[PDB]
Amino acid sequence: GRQNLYFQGMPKVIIFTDFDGTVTGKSGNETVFTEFYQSLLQGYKKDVEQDYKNTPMKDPIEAQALFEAKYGKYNENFDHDQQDVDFLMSPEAVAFFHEVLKNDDVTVNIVTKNRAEYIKAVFKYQGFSDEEISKLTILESGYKFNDVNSRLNHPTERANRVYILDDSPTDYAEMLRAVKGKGYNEEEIRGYRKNPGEFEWSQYLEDVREMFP
Ligand SMILES: [Cl-]
Ligand SMILES: [Cl-]
Ligand SMILES: [Mg+2]
């Protein structure tokens, strides 16, 4: 306990979460080939698909206009029962990310085969500020083991808790392998492998808030 300075004494949490079908209610391959997703790409032609991952995306303000055209304004009278609302984050997921993206002691990594431009447009449509979105680390190489392994090697501070969330068993298993290969043990890991729509975001919010005063 011998230390020459005061050092901050707060817990640290690291999140590795999938996006499509974990944060949203639709799996990746039920998302990126739809007319709606394809309409966000430059050069879109109705009933034509372009590479979903590498085709340049329309400007953010255009993507926002397309989200609003599809779903209306994400304001207080937003229609949460409308068709295709499963493309979006649930209200429980929205509340979770507002909490963790304002908490400097929580590092939020989204590990995905989707793309940062799309994820940022979803958060933006759903009321997140640029400041909040800038606290996301989006890892989109497509190989989740390498993405988590490389990220946990970064000289960040060691977590008291690591969250792993994924609706795909194979991708979950890769992230879990990477986390255990960086020295974390079972009581440090909170792993959730659920089907889309079945993640208890409000419970994870309560469990994360329990750690901080
Ligand atoms: Cl823009
Ligand atoms: Cl993915
Ligand atoms: Mg998924």
Side-chain angles (χ1 to χ4, degrees):
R2 163 94 272 288
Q3 324 183 115
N4 302 328
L5 294 174
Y6 300 139
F7 297 105
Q8 71 95 28
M10 282 223 274
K12 295 287 177 171
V13 182
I14 303 165
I15 298 165
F16 291 101
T17 181
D18 182 46
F19 183 75
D20 298 296
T22 298
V23 176
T24 77
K26 277 293 182 293
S27 76
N29 82 343
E30 295 173 19
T31 296
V32 299
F33 308 109
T34 62
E35 295 295 329
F36 175 62
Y37 188 98
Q38 291 283 322
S39 78
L40 306 170
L41 308 175
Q42 295 178 37
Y44 170 66
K45 295 191 302 139
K46 188 150 206 213
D47 210 25
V48 180
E49 286 150 39
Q50 300 183 98
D51 176 340
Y52 81 89
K53 176 95 178 189
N54 299 307
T55 302
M57 191 153 285
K58 284 170 184 175
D59 298 303
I61 198 58
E62 311 183 78
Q64 175 78 12
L66 290 165
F67 273 88
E68 291 179 355
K70 184 171 177 57
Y71 297 113
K73 263 74 213 182
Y74 198 79
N75 50 31
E76 211 56 70
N77 283 111
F78 175 80
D79 193 17
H80 277 98
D81 89 320
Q82 68 182 300
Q83 168 205 30
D84 285 357
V85 67
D86 289 355
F87 279 75
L88 305 176
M89 288 192 261
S90 62
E92 292 84 353
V94 165
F96 179 85
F97 285 99
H98 279 308
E99 176 76 29
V100 294
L101 294 173
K102 303 155 161 261
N103 184 337
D104 275 285
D105 293 317
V106 179
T107 300
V108 187
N109 304 283
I110 299 176
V111 189
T112 188
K113 297 162 202 180
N114 209 311
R115 52 197 290 183
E117 304 98 307
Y118 178 69
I119 292 165
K120 291 186 198 175
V122 171
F123 275 87
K124 179 58 51 190
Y125 170 65
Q126 295 193 258
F128 284 83
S129 70
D130 292 335
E131 188 192 329
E132 288 172 295
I133 293 176
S134 77
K135 311 276 172 61
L136 292 173
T137 294
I138 301 177
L139 302 168
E140 59 165 287
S141 82
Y143 184 26
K144 298 210 185 182
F145 174 82
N146 268 359
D147 275 352
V148 173
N149 182 69
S150 286
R151 181 66 168 140
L152 281 177
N153 190 51
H154 293 160
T156 72
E157 339 229 4
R158 163 148 294 255
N160 301 85
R161 192 134 326 294
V162 180
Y163 277 76
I164 310 163
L165 301 105
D166 206 312
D167 63 306
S168 154
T170 297
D171 292 305
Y172 177 88
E174 290 182 25
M175 303 203 276
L176 182 66
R177 212 137 44 222
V179 169
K180 291 178 185 292
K182 288 289 160 283
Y184 292 96
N185 49 35
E186 178 196 33
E187 81 256 28
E188 284 158 331
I189 300 163
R190 299 283 191 271
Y192 304 94
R193 209 300 296 173
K194 307 301 195 176
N195 299 323
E198 293 174 25
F199 291 88
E200 297 183 31
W201 289 108
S202 67
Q203 181 66 238
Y204 316 147
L205 173 62
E206 154 172 315
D207 293 348
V208 171
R209 267 156 67 170
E210 182 187 358
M211 292 179 58
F212 298 95

